[PDB]
Each structure stands twice: as structure tokens, then as C-alpha cells.
Design an enzyme around this catalytic site. Structure first.
Site, PDB file in Angstrom:
ATOM      1  N   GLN A 184       0.538  -0.851   0.246  1.00  0.00           N
ATOM      2  CA  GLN A 184      -0.388  -0.256  -0.049  1.00  0.00           C
ATOM      3  C   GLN A 184       1.162   1.446  -0.031  1.00  0.00           C
ATOM      4  OE1 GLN A 184      -2.899   0.381   2.912  1.00  0.00           O
ATOM      5  NE2 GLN A 184      -4.609  -0.531   2.123  1.00  0.00           N
ATOM      6  N   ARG A 312     -11.702  -5.068   9.194  1.00  0.00           N
ATOM      7  CA  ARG A 312     -12.090  -6.810   9.707  1.00  0.00           C
ATOM      8  C   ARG A 312     -13.103  -6.725  10.553  1.00  0.00           C
ATOM      9  NH1 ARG A 312      -8.017  -6.209  14.094  1.00  0.00           N
ATOM     10  NH2 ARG A 312      -6.279  -8.158  13.772  1.00  0.00           N
ATOM     11  N   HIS A 798      -3.882  -4.665  22.044  1.00  0.00           N
ATOM     12  CA  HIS A 798      -3.693  -5.463  21.703  1.00  0.00           C
ATOM     13  C   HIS A 798      -4.449  -7.164  23.385  1.00  0.00           C
ATOM     14  CE1 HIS A 798      -1.322  -9.272  20.060  1.00  0.00           C
ATOM     15  NE2 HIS A 798      -1.303  -9.961  21.865  1.00  0.00           N
TER      16      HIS A 798
END
EC number: 2.7.9.6
Length: 840
Positions: A184, A312, A798
Site C-alpha cells: 500500500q 476486519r 492488543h
């Protein structure tokens, strides 16, 4: 022709918008869904392409040395040792030296122009497919070579002993896995972060939360950053946890990052401005809507624009049943009332629903009751809250929090002494009849038969008399609990008056199992064989030993009367004791360890000895009171009612369960019949069809395995879930001093282990981990620990989402955590309040 014979070939480069569904074995998961993102209107996706799995094949697949090397890993290793490190090194080293073929590089070259150029840096996220767990993400890479270089490093990412082990752990083959590489454009940002379309603490679908840092946020960088966390509901910032940010991390001249000490004043500036906060929120929902599912969005802020980097589905989210009634509603877990809350296969869900007229829903493999009507009336509301205080309290409390969420819900005969005997006698007979007829039946007539039996079931198990008998016992304990408390100040007196009450088929089963245990204790051969056995057909091997034979018969007497039960009996698809006895053993061994010999008579005796003498104290104490002689006689009326009936309450379930098993065997015959007719693969596949769907199948030889396998797919995900005590139409999950951010509910007490490197770590079953920040590199170590504490913070850190999934309590965003907390200290963390405590 026409296509100059070029149609068949698989492309090495796919530009994003050029990506279309049903390719995903070319482009990976990340991409197939990164592709989809470009497509959506009014949202900026940085430009790039997708080196496909073909590239990974023609460079690495038929490389024979590679293939051989894979064979010397895949085939043998169970993740047992240093072998993995040693050979993964080897594989890795090879993948990088293995030069990208010339052909492919040019297709790359071409496509970078028109995106474009090369003086623009790149992100090289890595997309997986199996013919996540973990995969490498690289940033700020310069030009053709270091890009050529970094594609290879992406491939090698698939070898690190972390990711190999992930594949050995599950069933995955190292040859059945192939990486795609996403390329990207780089968006050098001065603010970035994470977005969840659904509250990360709650799973409320109408909250949308956001972590935002200066420069690179927490999911983009892997270092010690700080983030604000913002919550938005109904178009309005609802909550603002602003962090004092002294540091940020930005890209550099060359490719790496610096830690920029933020000047004072900006440290307590909102990272984002409210008009931007909401501006992002709407951008969130736009994408939520496009996909249909709640989404986990990674976002960049550049000049004033908003670039969605990655998007996602949110994976760990208890489903909301499709209940077609309007306005905010409440659903109570029947799972929890039944104490079961394991996920149910669909054929089991059928037989449950089919045997109750009550209106129940399904979500995430489990049952729910809609109670939002009973809660709309003061009179009904009051009844509900009250009855749940007795049976299943702690659902009460969950209910109670719903009751005053405020925004949320609108504002406002005792039959014969013969009966029980007659009810039992009747069901025993109805069952004898059932057994007889079912081996007669077969084919599409079996299904015919059992639909009619479901009628005899409801008939004999839930008559008006049955309900009154149950209820006479229940109503009777209630009356006693309240009235003795109201008169004598003694609570829950019914628990002790009903001790060792007759006619309790449950109670009888457990006592009888102790006798099964009592049989074995003389013979140490058999007891030492039971503990050391994995053979389901073991009762046969039993008569060998001195102990067996004696043992064998008692197990058969027991299985004959109680084999149809099991822990998960409401689900007709779970394994009954008599189906596999092996599942009955751990109860027996646990019975003989820690229960004395003979306790069948002993327990049960001092049972009623204590019941009657509570009755004597209560009645005597009561007559020493105003109108005492007549209340005392009122209670004696009730205590008698109690003991006569309290035991029958347990019997209808038993009787229904009996009928469930007899259906089960029949259907398994049908199932095995269906396999030697070649319509199903394995007979147990019937478990994944509701009753009627299965009934079709036996009439019309037709099955749709897209359906069965999706049901199997779905059931897997359900097992990873846990039903709330009460569940909300917005999805909200309502179950029953050093400061920081609560991120994963819980409370736990342990040894603080302050660790800065993964490799140095030694973690034992006691340890609570305290560290600066957390990688997906760090995930391997969450099986061991009991809590998480970190310096980095944000709702969707996370270590914040992994902590959550494991169910460990976690507090993040504690500024100096590695200094302030010394290693070794006992420590207590609260993950539902934000706090940590240093205790002696």
C-alpha cells in the site's frame, strides 16, 4: 481465442478495485476484505496492489529444497523442542536468499507506476490463506530493492517458531499455507488508531469506540504509545477518557521511527476534535453498514482527511437472536437457569423447543426467553424480579441492572396424596410402551411416530396435575422461607426442612453412585485400572481382575436406571453416560477419594435427622409467640406439603430425558441407515439439522452439505462463546490504589512478573504479567498468566482484546507500571474498576 488464450492464467498482481469476490485463494483474507474497502463510496483507501499467492508459489512452492525442508519440519515436529528454532532459522534464511523471479518483479514495477512512483514509501502487511494467528507487518520501506527484500521477509514471516507452532497446535499443514503480500501507499499521519463499531467492553451495538494517538497509534507501531479512548452513542460523544500523552512515534527519513517527546500542554489536548470524533464515527457506521457485520477499523488522520487502513469483522461477539418485536428488549439465558451454558447442536435445540409451548429464541447455540413484557408492568415486573431471587439469583442482579439503565426500557390447588405416585407410575408405563413401538418404526415413519409421541410426552409429563404437584412443593418452600423469616428471623429455612426428602430421582441417583463407588474400594486392581484407562469398551475388560465382575454388575444396574442422563442432557445430541461409560468414571474416583465408605445410608439418614429436628425447633419456638399456636400449625401444614412434593419437582425432566434418549437411538439408526444408503458421510452428521430438515432428508433422499458444514462452522465459533445471564436487543452482555483503565472484567490475585523481553520470560501458573506494551508477538504467553497490566492503554489495545478473549482481568494505561510495580510482589488487579493494589 479472442483472449489470445490468456483467460486461464492466475495473476501475480491484483490491484485493489480489480479484486472481486471468490478469489480469496489468490488474495488473502486481509486483502479480499481490504479490496472490498476501496469499493465503498466516500471513504479513502490508500492506493496499492496485492502480490498474490501465485508469486509465493512459483518462487517457493516447487522449490524442491524448500519442499524437502518443509517435509523435515511438517512431518515430525509436535513443537517439542529447539528443532523448530533451528530449522525455522534455516527455512527463513532460504526464503530471503531465494530471489524473486525476474518475470514477477516487472508486473510489480509496472503497477507501482500509476499509484505511484517509488519515492513514495510503502506498508507491506501480509495476507494469509489456507488451501489472524500471526503475520508480519512492515512500514516505511524505501524503493524497489528494500521492497523486493520485504516481500521475501513477509513470506518468511510464515515460518517464525511462533507461527509454525500455531499450525502444529491446530491441524494445519505447512504446505497447505501460502501468504499473499499487500502493498500500500504510506500515509505519514499525525493521528492514528483503532475503531470498534460495537462497545469493546459491552458488545453493545449502539456504542462505537475509538482509540486515537498522535502519530502512530497502538495497532500501527508496536511500541510505548498513549491513546485517548472515545465512546460515541446515537451520534453523540458519550465518554472521553483523555490520556496525558508525553510520547508519540512517527515514521522517519529512513525507515524506523523516533519517539518524539511531546511538549507540555499538547499532552492534555484532545488527540482529536469532537467534530472529527463524530466525523470518524459516521465513517465507522458507513463501513459497518456496507459489510453488514460489526467491524474493527484501523484509521489514519492526514492533513484533515480520514484514511481507513484496514477493516476486519469483529469476531468475538455473541449473536443477537432475530426476534421480530420492536423497541428495546430483554432476553434471559435459559442456559444458565438449566445450569448448562455449553453450546447446543441444532438437532438438540429442535427437540428442546419442540417440547415446550413457551416462546424461546436462539442465539449463539443457546436458548433465551423474551421477558420484556413481564417487565413492562409494575405487577408483572415485581413477580419476575422476585422469583429469580430464589432460583438463579445473580440473574436477578443482572436483571436488576437492566431495570434501571434508564435509557433502556420504557417507564411504567394441591392434588391428592395419590397423584405423585400416579404421575410416576404413569410415565414409567408410557416409557415401556415407547421402547416397544420404536424398534417397530423406521424410515419416514419413525419421524411420523415421534411427532405423535411428543404429544404423549407433553401429555404425561406436564398435565395440569404435574404442574400443580411441582408447584405445591415449590410454593410450600417459599411460604416457609418468607414466613419463618417474618416471624423468627431465620432465612432459607426451607433448604434444611427439605433435606433428605423422599422421591427425589436426582438425589437417589447420586447416592446410588456412591454405592457404585463403595463397591470398588476393596479391590485396588480395578480402581487403579479405572484411573489408567482410555478404553470406552472397558466394562468388558473388567471381569479379568479380582475386583471387576463385582464392579461390572453394579455399573450396569446403575447405567440401567440412570444411563440416559449426562451433564448436558437437555441437548439430545450430547453423549449419555451409558453411551460411553468413560465419562462416568471421574465422578466415581472423585467419590471414592474424599467420600467415606457407606455414606449412602449415613448422609441420607443424618439428612432427615436434621430435617425433623429443625421442624421441632421451629414449631416449639413458634408457639412461644403471639397467635403462636395457630401459625405453628399453619407451618406444619406447609412442611408436610413440602416433603411430599419437593422431590417430585425433579421428576418430569427425568421422564422427558428418558424419552429423549429413546428418540436419540432411533434417529441414530436412521442416521446409520442413511450412510449405507450413501446420503450422509458420517451418521452423526444428523446432529446438525433441525428435526424437520432431517425429516425431509429421510423422505426425499436429498441433503445440502453447504448447510450442514455452515452449521458445523457456526457451532465451532459458538463454543468459543459464553452466553450472558441476560442478553439485550442491542447485544449488551449483562452477567452477574494504583489507577488505570479497565479493559477486561474480573478480579484476580497473583505474583507480579515484570518482564520486558519475551525471551527472558519464565511464567508460572501464578503469574500476573506487567509490561510496557504488548505485540501479537506476545500472544503465545497469555495461556500461562492470570491478569495483564500494561503501560500502553486504550480500550482496544492488543493485550486488551486478548486478555478479554482468554477471560483474564486486565488493567491498561498505567503510566510507570514497570518501575512502580516491583517484580515478585503479590498484587491485586481489578479489571472492572480500573485499579491495581500493592499488598503485602
Amino acid at each position: 481465442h479472442h483472449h489470445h488464450h490468456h483467460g486461464s492464467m492466475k495473476p501475480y498482481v491484483l490491484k485493489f478495485q480489480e479484486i472481486r469476490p471468490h478469489s480469496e485463494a489468490l488474495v488473502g483474507g486481509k486483502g479480499m476484505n481490504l479490496g472490498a474497502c476501496s469499493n465503498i463510496e466516500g471513504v479513502h483507501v490508500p492506493a496499492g496492489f496485492c502480490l498474490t499467492t501465485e508469486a509465493y508459489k512459483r518462487t517457493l512452492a516447487e522449490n524442491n529444497e524448500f519442499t524437502q525442508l518443509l517435509q523435515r519440519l511438517s512431518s515430525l515436529k509436535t513443537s517439542d523442542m529447539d528443532a523448530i528454532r533451528e530449522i525455522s532459522e534455516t527455512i527463513r534464511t532460504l526464503i530471503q536468499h531465494t530471489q524473486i523471479p525476474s518475470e514477477i518483479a516487472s508486473y510489480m514495477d509496472a503497477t507501482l507506476l500509476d499509484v505511484g512512483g517509488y519515492e513514495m514509501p510503502f506498508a507491506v502487511r501480509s495476507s494469509a490463506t489456507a488451501e489472524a494467528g500471526q503475520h508480519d507487518t512492515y512500514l516505511n520501506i524505501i524503493g524497489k530493492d528494500a521492497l523486493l527484500q520485504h516481500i521475501s521477509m513477509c513470506w518468511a514471516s510464515l515460518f517464525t517458531e511462533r507461527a509454525i507452532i500455531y499450525r502444529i497446535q491446530n491441524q494445519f499443514d505447512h504446505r497447505k499455507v501460502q501468504l499473499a503480500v499487500v502493498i500500500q501507499q504510506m500515509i505519514s499521519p499525525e493521528a492514528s488508531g483503532i475503531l470498534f463499531t460495537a462497545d469493546p467492553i459491552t458488545s453493545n451495538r449502539k456504542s462505537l469506540s475509538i482509540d486515537a494517538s498522535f502519530g502512530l497509534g497502538e495497532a500501527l507501531v508496536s511500541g510505548l504509545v498513549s491513546a485517548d479512548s472515545y465512546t460515541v452513542r446515537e451520534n453523540t460523544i458519550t465518554n472521553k477518557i483523555i490520556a496525558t500523552k508525553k510520547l508519540a512515534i512517527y515514521s522517519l527519513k529512513e525507515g524506523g521511527t523516533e519517539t518524539r517527546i511531546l511538549e507540555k500542554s499538547q499532552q492534555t489536548k484532545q488527540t482529536l476534535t469532537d467534530q472529527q470524533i463524530i466525523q470518524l464515527a459516521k465513517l465507522g457506521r458507513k463501513i459497518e453498514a456496507y459489510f453488514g457485520k460489526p467491524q474493527d477499523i484501523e484509521w489514519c488522520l492526514a492533513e484533515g482527511a480520514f484514511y481507513i487502513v484496514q477493516s476486519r469483522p469483529i469476531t468475538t461477539l455473541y449473536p443477537i437472536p432475530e426476534v421480530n418485536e420492536p423497541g428495546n428488549r430483554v432476553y434471559i439465558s435459559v442456559a444458565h437457569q438449566q445450569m448448562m451454558t455449553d453450546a447446543m447442536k441444532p438437532l438438540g435445540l429442535s427437540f428442546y423447543l419442540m417440547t415446550t409451548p413457551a416462546t424461546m429464541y436462539t442465539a449463539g447455540g443457546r436458548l433465551f426467553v423474551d421477558i420484556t413484557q413481564s417487565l413492562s408492568a409494575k405487577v408483572s415486573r415485581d413477580m419476575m424480579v422476585n422469583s429469580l431471587g430464589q432460583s438463579d439469583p445473580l440473574i436477578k442482579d443482572a436483571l436488576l441492572t437492566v431495570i434501571n439503565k434508564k435509557g433502556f426500557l420504557p417507564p411504567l390447588s394441591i392434588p391428592d396424596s395419590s397423584s405423585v405416585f400416579e404421575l410416576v407410575r404413569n410415565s414409567e408405563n408410557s416409557i415401556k410402551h415407547l421402547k416397544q413401538s420404536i424398534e417397530t418404526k423406521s424410515g419416514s415413519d419413525l419421524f411420523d411416530f415421534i411427532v405423535e409421541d411428543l404429544e404423549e410426552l407433553k401429555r404425561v409429563l406436564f398435565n395440569p396435575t404435574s404442574i400443580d404437584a411441582i408447584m405445591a412443593g415449590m410454593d410450600a418452600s417459599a411460604w416457609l422461607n418468607e414466613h419463618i423469616y417474618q416471624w423468627l428471623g431465620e432465612k432459607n429455612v426451607a433448604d434444611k426442612l427439605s433435606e433428605s426428602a423422599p422421591n427425589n430421582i436426582t438425589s437417589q441417583m447420586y447416592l446410588e453412585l456412591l454405592d457404585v463407588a463403595d463397591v470398588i474400594r476393596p479391590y485396588p486392581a480395578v480402581r487403579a485400572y479405572l484411573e489408567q484407562t482410555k478404553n470406552p469398551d472397558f466394562m468388558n475388560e473388567l471381569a479379568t481382575l479380582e475386583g471387576g465382575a463385582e464392579t461390572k454388575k453394579a455399573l450396569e444396574d446403575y447405567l440401567q436406571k440412570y444411563g440416559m442422563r449426562c451433564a448436558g442432557e437437555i441437548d439430545l445430541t450430547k453423549t449419555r453416560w451409558i453411551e460411553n461409560p468413560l465419562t462416568l468414571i471421574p465422578l466415581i474416583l472423585s467419590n471414592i477419594k474424599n467420600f467415606d465408605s457407606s455414606a449412602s445410608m449415613h448422609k441420607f439418614a443424618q439428612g432427615e435427622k436434621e430435617a425433623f429436628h429443625k421442624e421441632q425447633e421451629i414449631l416449639r419456638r413458634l408457639q412461644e409467640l403471639p397467635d403462636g399456636e395457630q401459625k405453628a400449625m399453619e407451618t406444619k401444614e406447609k412442611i408436610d406439603i413440602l416433603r411430599h412434593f419437593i422431590g417430585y419437582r425433579e421428576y418430569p425432566k427425568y421422564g422427558m430425558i428418558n424419552r429423549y434418549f429413546i428418540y436419540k437411538l432411533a434417529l441414530l439408526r436412521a442416521g446409520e441407515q442413511l450412510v449405507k444408503d450413501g446420503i450422509l458421510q458420517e451418521h452423526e452428521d444428523i446432529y446438525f439439522l433441525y428435526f424437520e430438515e432431517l425429516r425431509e432428508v429421510v423422505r426425499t433422499g436429498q441433503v445440502d452439505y453447504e448447510l450442514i458444514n455452515a452449521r458445523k462452522r457456526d457451532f465451532a465459533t459458538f463454543e468459543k462463546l459464553t452466553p450472558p445471564r441476560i442478553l439485550t436487543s442491542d447485544g449488551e452482555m449483562i452477567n452477574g490504589a494504583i489507577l488505570g483503565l479497565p479493559v477486561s472484567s474480573g478480579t484476580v490475585e497473583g505474583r507480579a512478573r515484570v518482564i520486558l523481553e519475551m525471551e527472558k520470560a519464565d511464567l508460572e501458573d501464578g503469574d500476573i504479567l506487567v509490561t510496557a506494551y504488548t505485540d501479537p508477538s506476545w500472544t503465545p504467553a497469555f495461556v500461562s498468566i492470570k491478569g495483564l497490566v500494561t503501560e500502553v492503554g486504550g480500550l482496544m489495545t492488543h493485550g486488551a482484546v486478548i486478555a478479554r478473549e482468554y477471560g483474564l482481568p486486565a488493567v491498561v494505561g498505567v503510566e510507570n507500571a514497570t518501575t512502580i510495580i516491583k517484580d515478585g510482589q503479590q498484587i491485586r488487579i481489578n479489571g472492572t474498576e480500573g485499579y491495581i493494589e500493592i499488598l503485602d
